[PDB]
Ligand SMILES: [Cl-]
């Protein structure tokens with residue numbers, strides 16, 4: 001059987017491998033296919049920081065942080081809320097449907113702070129590493145790459161300092177043991 | 193003055209910072225804005241592995257390689273051409289206009305090898321690092337992240353083993369010293 005999973009970026013950088021590897025081990029017969037952005041229903045599961053409006057299960061909340069180069073010329077510790085958009089920002093392309101960065105660049109003034117739009121947070125962190133730009137990232141992602149990319153990881157002094165991870169699937173249009181098995185697996189893997 | 197540069201992924205992971213930093217230093221008055229995918233003309237420059245068909249200057253050729261986890265269970269050295277699509281692949285979303293990965297997944301059989309599509313090669317390498325999937329990447333990118341992502345970097349035994357980097361801009365519809373200055377700067381930075 002084939003399952004088509006959408007694990008929306010940037011969550012594909014932690015959860016896709018966990019899911020792929022676990023199903024590879026316990027059900028080598030089952031073929032899981034992964035995409036990392038949205039856009040056959042009964043084979044579909046979405047894991048995302050959005051609810052796309054299918055079911056919707058909130059799994060966990062992730063802290064979001066501010067990242068900058070370790071050797072930033074002026075940033076040497078936490079910022080005030082008013083300071084944030086006086087920095088130059090790197091973000092994920094705002095034109096992308098459900099872009100990760102959208103919540104924090106929803107006014108002209110905030111958008112004006114952006115000097116670079118990349119295709120994924122992983123690209124964003126590479127540019128932050130190499131420049132004086134700042135970015136807003138999940139703590140887990142920033143902390144994974146802080147050592148190799150020489151990043152400082154700071155609290156985000158904005159009201160929107162978390163995102164909620166949701167698991168979503170097509171409501172049972174009939175009984176389906178394999179589908180229910182995958183529902184249970186994905187909750188377990190995500191909650192772990 | 194504002195220049196709008198598109199440095200198409202994955203090249204934004206090496207060239208965007210070089211350009212941003214150099215112009216920041218030598219012309220702090222000039223505002224360079226960056227995007228990393230295509231889709232005001234006289235302020236526009238594109239740097240990409242495509243010619244989008246504006247001028248078109250071929251700058252350099254980059255070797256493309258095969259990447260896999262260092263501790264891959266079966267891959268322990270170079271592959272034969274026929275072996276490549278018998279592995280499970282991670283690639284950049286093929287539906288994206290001018291997706292980096294498109295040249296290598298242009299048949300049903302090749303597409304069938306894909307288990308994961310991500311939004312950028314930087315995301316792809318993170319998943320390769322964590323799984324048994326393989327991917328096709330620029331050598332410079334793979335070699336930058338091989339140590340931290342514990343990757344092996346292998347020659348690509350396919351005919352399409354290089355991509356050409358092009359610089360492209362709007363033909364002079366009138367004389368423009370600032371535009372010509374930026375043309376000269378970008379050739380210099382890219383060729384260096
Ligand atoms: Cl992302």
Ligand SMILES: [Cl-]
Nearest residue numbers: 201202312313
């Ligand atoms: Cl890419």
